[PDB]
Amino acid sequence: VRRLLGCLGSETRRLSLFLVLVVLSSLGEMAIPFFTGRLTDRNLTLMSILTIASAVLEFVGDGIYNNTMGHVHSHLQGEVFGAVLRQETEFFQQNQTGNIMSRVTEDTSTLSDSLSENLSLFLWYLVRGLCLLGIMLSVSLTMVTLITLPLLFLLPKKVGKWYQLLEVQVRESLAKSSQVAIEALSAMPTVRSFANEEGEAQKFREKLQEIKTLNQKEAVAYAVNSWTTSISGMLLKVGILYIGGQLVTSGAVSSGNLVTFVLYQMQFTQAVEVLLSIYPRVQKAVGSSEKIFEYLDRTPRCPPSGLLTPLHLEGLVQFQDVSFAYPNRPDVLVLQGLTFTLRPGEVTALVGPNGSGKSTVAALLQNLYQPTGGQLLLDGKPLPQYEHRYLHRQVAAVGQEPQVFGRSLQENIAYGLTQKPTMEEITAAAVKSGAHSFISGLPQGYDTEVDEAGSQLSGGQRQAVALARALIRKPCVLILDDATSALDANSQLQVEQLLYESPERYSRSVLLITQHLSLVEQADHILFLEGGAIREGGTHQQLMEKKGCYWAMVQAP
Amino acid sequence: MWRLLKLSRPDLPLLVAAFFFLVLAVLGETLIPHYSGRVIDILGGDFDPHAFASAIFFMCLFSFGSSLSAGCRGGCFTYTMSRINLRIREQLFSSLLRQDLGFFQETKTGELNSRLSSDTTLMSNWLPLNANVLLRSLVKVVGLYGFMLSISPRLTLLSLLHMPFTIAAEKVYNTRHQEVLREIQDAVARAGQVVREAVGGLQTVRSFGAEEHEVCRYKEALEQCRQLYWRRDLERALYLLVRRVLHLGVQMLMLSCGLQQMLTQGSLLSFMIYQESVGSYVQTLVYIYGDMLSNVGAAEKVFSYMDRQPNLPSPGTLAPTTLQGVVKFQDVSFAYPNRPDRPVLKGLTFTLRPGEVTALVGPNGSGKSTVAALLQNLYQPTGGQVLLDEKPISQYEHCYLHSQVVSVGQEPVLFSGSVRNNIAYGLQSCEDDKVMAAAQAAHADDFIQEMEHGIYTDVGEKGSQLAAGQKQRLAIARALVRDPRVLILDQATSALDVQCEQALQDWNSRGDRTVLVIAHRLQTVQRAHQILVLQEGKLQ
Ligand SMILES: Nc1ncnc2c1ncn2[C@@H]1O[C@H](COP(=O)(O)OP(=O)(O)OP(=O)(O)O)[C@@H](O)[C@H]1O
Ligand SMILES: Nc1ncnc2c1ncn2[C@@H]1O[C@H](COP(=O)(O)OP(=O)(O)OP(=O)(O)O)[C@@H](O)[C@H]1O
Ligand SMILES: [Mg+2]
Ligand SMILES: [Mg+2]
């Protein structure tokens, strides 16, 4: 409950100004009939001036409150998304995209809406009740009212936890439905290829049934709570009415001085009723914001970024007994005992069967995961010692199935660079990767917008754009992970000349992972990886005269 | 404006029950203050055995009945609007799946999810705040207009004077309000797409170290949304202030005309509070009716999506018990609907036979996957025709056709279910023996046993907890579990190693399957009976 009030602590000056305005307006509303502007003319123009001044103050208070609440909503929604992206990689395996999006975009909006609806009402009726308590001090009945008032707060405190326990579940159900929807909408050519629209509709209906089940309990609880707060207010009125009628006859307070207490009591009881009605909404708001506050309070398991930015860096990468276990499924080793060196000016190829662990090596080299039982060093220093942007500028990769974003071609090649590159550099990178042939033929050129996940491009064109995106950085450490799986015979010559004939190969160390064994013949080193272990190593010839697994793979037909 | 009532038609008994409880509630809270006054004016001497106790008991029972009816009305309204919101969500999601494939490229997935999440709740949350206020205001205006007995010409002057309550200003405010609500919803969808794209592609974002860029983009979108919200709030507050200022212009005129007539002084000051109350209540009624209309009209995008007809032909009715499997492209020319006037195919004509294997080769961007997608009836040709057993391929039933013509795509797409839920995808019933046979035929059963739970292992989202070759084998098994008649393989061995490539090379051991392979590398299509080489969309 303290987190909800602490999330609005960046606007303390504006809330204090609104509180001063509320106090002034309420004290004006409760001091009108005592004075009414005697003499000083005629009185109807004074009534007009009073109405105008009552309108202006309400306008100012509404403007201040609305501006403050908009700032609070935008700030909180920004901080939740900022906290989500700081987590580790495997955090995005337990949590799906639709669930995270429903947490970020919909739970925060609900929390902000509830907060903005309830805070001003609470402040208004609290100030109203606090003043009406003051002006009603028959003195003797006030302590009676104040000792019978905690009892009416006994029932909600035993109930409000229920209001949380429903709400969390409701939010979870909504997130699940969202994920289903997005998984149907990002793969429409596949779904229609198997005639499975009815299956997606049924999958949506399964979660909608759970939401429908929870809504009935919500409605029943709302009706029962309204009943209870109304009976509590009625009892609060009737008890003081009965004690006043009894005290009138037996001397004590005279009926003349007792009647004025009762008008004040009818308004104080209504203020107490409103304050009682607010509390279940506060418990519901605590229920609605459990996951986003868990995200905000979560600490990531990845090591933090370093502060090393050397001016000159070489592509000397060392593995020393590196093992990995993939913490989603621990106690099974994907890599056992890897130990190899990448030297600048050289190509090292990583060959092996399917599922052997080559993309795991590529992901370990990108500092996406930390090794379980070894050391991975870049120029004699660990990867977490370097700055995030510097390390991911120096080491670059393509990926097994490359991904592009929904923007123009010029900022897809230059995605992530802090200093924007010139159009001539983008043209040079596209010429180097072979993407210049089709981009120049497009009607808008490099400004051509591609859609979400690049549906307007074919596989080879997407691979060429990814290669150009990797090439624009001038990366000393280059990783290729099946980069020619969709390229034709004309576009493989560009990759071959990049690997073994470019002038820049002396400024790079290349790790090449392919199933096409024609590119492996000119590699400086070849490593055969089976079951996460390096079975063989050496050049092409030394692996051929020794027979073995590499010769078995090569002499397959 | 009338579709919403037709959609809310299955919620009629809850609505009429809520109205019954609402009129009971307003009757109770109307009748309470009279007996409260009877309770309080007994102060001139207390009566112990009677008078006081009867009055407080009657007030007790009146408040009890009013409270019970109010709680029942609130619960009924809450349940009704939850049901209506869920119905709108279900209908919109069912309508979205029928659209053509060009609809999903002009739109974005995060924006559609933002519509389905927020725009549906926008057209449901207003009634529990609006209906009770509007009905209470109407009841109080009707009751306060029942004070005709006081003075005769006052109501006749009132109706004519307060009839023009700034109609032009009301229309101006309603137009501006509807426009700003539409802009707010568009900005919210645009902000959601940023989170959509950043979270979905997190591995590439982390690999380039560009999370701060995505945070900055999201904060820019949030700033735009906040500016739109503040514009809406300032406009509403200014309109309310203008109304409250202009309310006095009739009150001072009536209070001057009473003095002008010199109905007495004791009766002239007997309805000023009544006049203020009835004016404020009719202003509130008009304002909340306008807010109702604007908030209903601001959600026209959801109505437009639910009444959108897809650009697809009439659905097929053919389902033969036997299919030969001969496929004919005749003079087929195609250009994509989202990017027209740039032809991809330029008069293709060929035949695919059941007993032969056909290879389709060409450079990048030549149009081979376009040929496959036209073969699977995913797009309609702009010229020529695609024939399956001498009939057009759009004349066959949707569920029948896609169990006979099956393809493995260029990039296989898996889902979040288990292994066997992906192998048996789209099938109403499938025994485990068929699933294991299809896994054996695709050489996938070797790595299935290595996973925990076997075929019940939770494949990750988009198949992200597997290798690429394992995903390829799962897609091949998913294609082969259907026992197809026409099988298309759009680079189906692009991730498998050498041994799995030479193991899966026949594709026609049955001898009665029309196979079309699409390949880039050679030395895998020597055994193809027919070879078709196409460059820039023209067969050579
Ligand atoms: N996110 C993940 N969580 C758990 N296990 C995973 C994950 N990604 C991969 N694996 C497993 O790790 C092992 C190695 O997979 P990896 O992607 O490294 O193979 P690979 O050698 O690149 O394969 P291929 O040649 O088919 O592309 C496999 O058994 C795979 O199922
Ligand atoms: N969804 C789409 N919308 C618009 N144009 C598209 C779309 N998909 C492909 N294209 C364009 O159509 C042409 C042919 O692409 P297609 O995918 O059919 O080629 P392909 O021969 O299968 O390619 P590859 O060998 O690279 O896989 C290209 O110019 C491509 O940019
Ligand atoms: Mg791999
Ligand atoms: Mg293709």
Side-chain angles (χ1 to χ4, degrees), chain A residues 1 3-41 43-557, chain B:
Chain A
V1 201
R3 288 235 47 188
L4 273 71
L5 298 182
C7 88
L8 62 80
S10 61
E11 303 290 318
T12 322
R13 302 281 116 191
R14 316 260 275 276
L15 277 313
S16 47
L17 187 48
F18 180 66
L19 191 43
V20 168
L21 258 286
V22 156
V23 164
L24 165 69
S25 184
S26 268
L27 286 173
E29 279 267 38
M30 248 165 268
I32 171 175
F34 306 139
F35 288 161
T36 74
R38 294 181 185 174
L39 313 102
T40 178
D41 297 346
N43 53 298
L44 303 322
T45 81
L46 164 142
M47 147 75 68
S48 84
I49 282 291
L50 172 131
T51 323
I52 279 158
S54 178
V56 174
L57 228 59
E58 148 180 5
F59 171 78
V60 176
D62 289 345
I64 298 177
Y65 186 74
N66 290 322
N67 200 10
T68 295
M69 289 295 109
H71 269 103
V72 164
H73 175 31
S74 82
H75 178 84
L76 187 67
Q77 200 148 50
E79 305 316 299
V80 176
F81 190 53
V84 164
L85 292 187
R86 280 197 321 257
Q87 304 300 318
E88 67 263 1
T89 319
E90 63 260 21
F91 172 81
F92 295 88
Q93 308 264 24
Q94 324 151 3
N95 297 261
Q96 327 267 47
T97 308
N99 304 13
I100 295 177
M101 188 170 344
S102 191
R103 297 324 176 147
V104 172
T105 47
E106 279 290 287
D107 290 12
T108 316
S109 182
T110 303
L111 172 65
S112 306
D113 289 345
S114 64
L115 209 159
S116 66
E117 172 223 348
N118 287 287
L119 178 62
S120 63
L121 183 76
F122 170 74
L123 285 177
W124 275 119
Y125 275 92
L126 172 66
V127 172
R128 204 160 291 140
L130 210 30
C131 294
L132 284 162
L133 159 84
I135 87 160
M136 80 192 217
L137 206 152
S138 180
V139 189
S140 277
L141 269 62
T142 304
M143 292 177 72
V144 157
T145 301
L146 261 59
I147 64 107
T148 199
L149 170 143
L151 255 296
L152 313 184
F153 282 97
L154 265 199
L155 192 95
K157 291 176 181 287
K158 204 101 164 222
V159 162
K161 272 288 303 203
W162 170 264
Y163 276 103
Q164 312 183 17
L165 291 207
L166 282 169
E167 199 42 59
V168 170
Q169 298 167 44
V170 167
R171 298 323 290 180
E172 288 174 1
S173 310
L174 283 164
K176 284 169 178 294
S177 94
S178 288
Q179 161 70 22
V180 158
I182 217 155
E183 212 164 17
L185 290 179
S186 307
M188 276 314 293
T190 306
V191 167
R192 199 178 305 275
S193 176
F194 290 102
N196 203 54
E197 288 109 294
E198 226 60 47
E200 309 298 318
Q202 191 65 35
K203 274 194 274 203
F204 212 55
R205 289 194 266 267
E206 297 325 85
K207 279 90 201 165
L208 293 202
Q209 271 297 307
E210 311 163 354
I211 308 166
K212 170 182 161 287
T213 299
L214 292 155
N215 288 335
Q216 299 164 43
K217 281 200 266 271
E218 275 190 331
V220 168
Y222 174 77
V224 172
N225 179 264
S226 163
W227 291 349
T228 50
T229 191
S230 300
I231 307 314
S232 78
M234 176 178 73
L235 263 169
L236 193 53
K237 285 211 241 291
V238 168
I240 215 65
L241 210 49
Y242 177 76
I243 199 144
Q246 178 260 290
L247 267 174
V248 153
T249 36
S250 67
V253 181
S254 67
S255 183
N257 311 275
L258 193 136
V259 60
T260 62
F261 188 86
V262 190
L263 297 313
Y264 306 177
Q265 203 64 10
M266 271 66 88
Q267 315 165 73
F268 177 72
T269 309
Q270 219 269 310
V272 163
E273 263 164 18
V274 174
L275 291 185
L276 278 165
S277 295
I278 287 165
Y279 180 89
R281 325 202 197 128
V282 176
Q283 298 305 307
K284 203 184 204 287
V286 175
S288 295
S289 61
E290 219 145 80
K291 204 65 171 171
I292 59 171
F293 282 160
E294 182 207 300
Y295 286 176
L296 281 162
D297 296 327
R298 194 181 186 276
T299 183
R301 304 171 170 41
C302 50
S305 324
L307 55 99
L308 260 81
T309 44
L311 203 74
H312 183 47
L313 203 77
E314 321 196 0
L316 184 64
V317 177
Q318 310 192 56
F319 282 70
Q320 281 142 338
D321 181 65
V322 166
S323 49
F324 192 56
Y326 259 125
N328 294 286
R329 188 190 170 195
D331 280 295
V332 55
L333 256 55
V334 183
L335 317 159
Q336 324 273 340
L338 313 181
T339 297
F340 56 93
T341 325
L342 302 194
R343 329 286 301 226
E346 291 176 27
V347 187
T348 290
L350 200 69
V351 287
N354 280 112
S356 34
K358 299 164 273 159
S359 303
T360 306
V361 175
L364 272 194
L365 199 38
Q366 291 157 4
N367 207 35
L368 286 184
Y369 294 98
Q370 307 300 315
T372 286
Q375 318 156 52
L376 168 48
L377 303 180
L378 174 65
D379 276 308
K381 279 146 222 314
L383 296 196
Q385 289 218 23
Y386 295 95
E387 198 224 324
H388 196 234
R389 295 200 141 271
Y390 180 84
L391 176 77
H392 287 123
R393 225 172 28 219
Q394 292 301 301
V395 174
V398 173
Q400 174 121 33
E401 323 273 32
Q403 284 195 255
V404 298
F405 301 95
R407 68 215 37 214
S408 76
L409 285 167
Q410 83 164 10
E411 41 176 27
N412 244 321
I413 301 189
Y415 174 73
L417 288 169
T418 50
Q419 184 204 311
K420 257 190 46 58
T422 312
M423 181 35 78
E424 271 96 10
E425 310 176 11
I426 308 185
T427 304
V431 162
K432 277 197 288 174
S433 83
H436 200 51
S437 306
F438 74 98
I439 292 166
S440 46
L442 290 173
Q444 320 167 40
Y446 285 89
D447 289 345
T448 307
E449 300 276 345
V450 311
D451 71 354
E452 188 170 59
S455 310
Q456 271 86 30
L457 303 169
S458 44
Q461 302 180 344
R462 210 176 303 135
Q463 276 218 290
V465 169
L467 186 51
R469 170 177 73 199
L471 278 190
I472 196 63
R473 274 140 182 86
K474 323 291 172 63
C476 55
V477 181
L478 190 61
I479 301 156
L480 307 165
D481 201 359
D482 270 296
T484 63
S485 52
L487 300 178
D488 49 345
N490 219 57
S491 291
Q492 282 159 19
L493 267 39
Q494 313 263 11
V495 192
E496 182 219 340
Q497 290 151 16
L498 168 138
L499 286 176
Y500 310 110
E501 285 157 44
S502 195
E504 323 179 348
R505 44 169 175 161
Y506 312 108
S507 78
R508 273 184 322 227
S509 61
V510 195
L511 177 74
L512 171 78
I513 303 155
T514 43
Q515 314 275 0
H516 203 207
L517 299 190
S518 80
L519 280 168
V520 196
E521 299 204 10
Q522 291 162 85
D524 273 271
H525 299 266
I526 306 169
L527 311 161
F528 196 89
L529 179 71
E530 172 144 50
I534 304 283
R535 311 259 79 107
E536 287 182 323
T539 74
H540 175 78
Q541 297 294 326
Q542 303 185 337
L543 284 193
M544 291 305 268
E545 280 87 20
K546 77 178 292 299
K547 300 312 171 25
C549 315
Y550 182 73
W551 173 89
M553 200 175 34
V554 163
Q555 310 260 309
Chain B
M1 69 297 277
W2 213 356
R3 297 183 67 190
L4 207 42
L5 300 182
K6 301 176 189 182
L7 171 140
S8 86
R9 158 77 189 274
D11 293 278
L12 276 198
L14 288 158
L15 280 172
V16 303
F19 295 147
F20 178 44
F21 295 139
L22 167 63
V23 62
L24 263 201
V26 302
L27 158 84
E29 61 210 34
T30 311
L31 209 36
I32 274 280
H34 168 258
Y35 296 137
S36 85
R38 178 54 85 94
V39 153
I40 189 173
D41 84 316
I42 206 183
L43 90 163
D46 216 58
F47 318 73
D48 175 52
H50 285 327
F52 203 38
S54 185
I56 67 171
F57 166 68
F58 275 33
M59 208 179 38
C60 278
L61 75 99
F62 273 17
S63 188
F64 189 57
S66 169
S67 48
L68 261 46
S69 91
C72 288
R73 166 209 75 215
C76 288
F77 274 142
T78 299
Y79 188 39
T80 319
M81 292 286 137
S82 298
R83 274 171 51 131
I84 285 179
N85 170 46
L86 283 200
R87 186 168 315 125
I88 290 163
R89 281 182 180 234
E90 180 227 319
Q91 274 177 30
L92 180 58
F93 186 71
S94 287
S95 182
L96 277 177
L97 290 166
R98 299 192 296 252
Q99 303 303 317
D100 41 299
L101 285 185
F103 171 78
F104 300 97
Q105 271 153 8
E106 75 189 40
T107 57
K108 307 187 142 296
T109 319
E111 314 199 329
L112 288 179
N113 205 43
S114 165
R115 298 308 180 145
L116 194 41
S117 309
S118 315
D119 293 31
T120 63
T121 55
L122 198 84
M123 41 196 288
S124 308
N125 290 0
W126 45 270
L127 198 295
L129 295 173
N130 285 18
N132 45 35
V133 171
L134 184 134
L135 264 293
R136 281 166 38 237
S137 70
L138 207 162
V139 163
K140 287 293 301 287
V141 170
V142 166
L144 262 298
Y145 263 112
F147 272 52
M148 292 177 72
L149 81 163
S150 286
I151 302 103
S152 149
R154 293 301 186 199
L155 292 191
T156 85
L157 291 171
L158 201 169
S159 286
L160 188 130
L161 224 35
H162 198 55
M163 162 56 218
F165 38 80
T166 74
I167 295 305
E170 286 272 355
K171 302 292 294 318
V172 159
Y173 172 69
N174 289 347
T175 315
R176 293 205 88 169
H177 196 52
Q178 205 173 349
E179 288 167 355
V180 75
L181 292 189
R182 267 200 290 277
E183 296 192 30
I184 277 168
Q185 293 309 311
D186 292 359
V188 163
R190 258 155 38 215
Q193 176 60 35
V194 173
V195 153
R196 178 64 180 86
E197 196 144 36
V199 172
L202 188 271
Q203 286 237 356
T204 317
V205 175
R206 189 149 297 184
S207 157
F208 289 118
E211 287 115 321
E212 287 95 333
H213 179 50
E214 311 287 333
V215 171
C216 289
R217 295 209 319 142
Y218 194 50
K219 287 186 175 188
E220 292 169 16
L222 289 187
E223 183 56 55
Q224 287 194 4
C225 295
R226 176 198 79 80
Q227 280 163 20
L228 275 159
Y229 285 134
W230 168 236
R231 155 172 171 231
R232 174 202 67 193
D233 295 329
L234 181 62
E235 269 181 4
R236 163 165 55 239
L238 189 40
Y239 165 74
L240 255 55
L241 160 77
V242 156
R243 269 203 311 160
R244 284 192 41 90
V245 155
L246 175 140
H247 181 224
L248 294 193
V250 289
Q251 246 205 341
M252 311 275 148
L253 181 54
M254 311 165 107
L255 203 42
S256 296
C257 82
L259 266 294
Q260 198 269 340
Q261 207 269 333
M262 295 306 109
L263 179 58
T264 185
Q265 173 95 329
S267 69
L268 183 62
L269 275 309
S270 78
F271 67 98
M272 277 312 117
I273 38 176
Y274 298 147
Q275 188 67 42
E276 178 258 2
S277 282
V278 71
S280 174
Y281 283 171
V282 69
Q283 274 182 2
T284 307
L285 206 162
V286 152
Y287 157 73
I288 184 151
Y289 177 74
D291 166 36
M292 201 175 163
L293 230 43
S294 303
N295 189 293
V296 168
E300 274 306 293
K301 199 90 171 189
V302 161
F303 293 120
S304 79
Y305 285 161
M306 278 169 13
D307 265 8
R308 170 180 136 68
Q309 287 293 123
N311 292 4
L312 310 164
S314 43
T317 53
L318 291 176
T321 165
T322 168
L323 194 85
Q324 194 170 359
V326 47
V327 155
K328 277 186 280 191
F329 259 46
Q330 297 184 328
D331 208 4
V332 168
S333 78
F334 181 69
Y336 277 96
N338 53 75
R339 187 148 88 211
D341 64 56
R342 194 201 91 61
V344 195
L345 310 172
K346 281 137 203 161
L348 261 67
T349 293
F350 53 88
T351 312
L352 263 49
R353 296 285 178 184
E356 88 183 357
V357 182
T358 309
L360 191 73
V361 284
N364 280 128
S366 34
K368 315 181 283 275
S369 311
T370 297
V371 170
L374 258 69
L375 211 67
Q376 303 183 250
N377 202 40
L378 295 190
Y379 290 97
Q380 305 306 311
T382 77
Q385 50 196 357
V386 185
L387 304 183
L388 178 65
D389 278 19
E390 281 282 88
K391 303 295 182 187
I393 207 158
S394 57
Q395 292 200 357
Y396 288 90
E397 202 224 315
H398 179 57
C399 288
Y400 173 81
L401 180 73
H402 286 119
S403 67
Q404 302 277 342
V405 181
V406 185
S407 88
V408 193
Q410 179 139 20
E411 302 289 338
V413 173
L414 292 197
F415 294 87
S416 297
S418 47
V419 164
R420 90 163 294 281
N421 275 4
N422 282 296
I423 291 186
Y425 185 76
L427 283 183
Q428 281 317 109
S429 173
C430 209
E431 310 93 318
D432 271 298
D433 313 328
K434 284 271 310 162
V435 174
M436 305 295 344
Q440 284 172 30
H443 293 328
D445 69 316
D446 53 68
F447 73 92
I448 284 304
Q449 28 179 52
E450 315 287 333
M451 333 169 65
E452 43 176 22
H453 320 311
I455 35 165
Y456 304 110
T457 320
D458 203 288
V459 163
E461 182 176 41
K462 273 187 313 145
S464 56
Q465 287 184 25
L466 301 155
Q470 314 194 331
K471 203 173 57 157
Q472 277 266 30
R473 284 160 192 169
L474 281 200
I476 292 167
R478 162 176 77 185
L480 288 185
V481 86
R482 294 183 181 277
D483 191 26
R485 177 70 60 238
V486 182
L487 184 61
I488 310 143
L489 303 135
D490 194 6
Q491 312 209 29
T493 64
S494 59
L496 324 167
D497 40 33
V498 183
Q499 313 305 99
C500 199
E501 261 184 77
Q502 53 174 40
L504 301 153
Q505 252 200 353
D506 40 353
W507 297 120
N508 213 10
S509 38
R510 306 306 307 124
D512 52 359
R513 196 140 67 180
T514 313
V515 188
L516 172 89
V517 307
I518 295 159
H520 260 306
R521 90 171 204 83
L522 267 283
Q523 308 144 336
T524 175
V525 294
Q526 313 114 330
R527 35 198 320 138
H529 201 294
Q530 196 188 36
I531 301 186
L532 309 159
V533 195
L534 90 165
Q535 173 144 20
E536 53 101 27
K538 223 157 307 196
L539 227 62
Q540 308 273 340

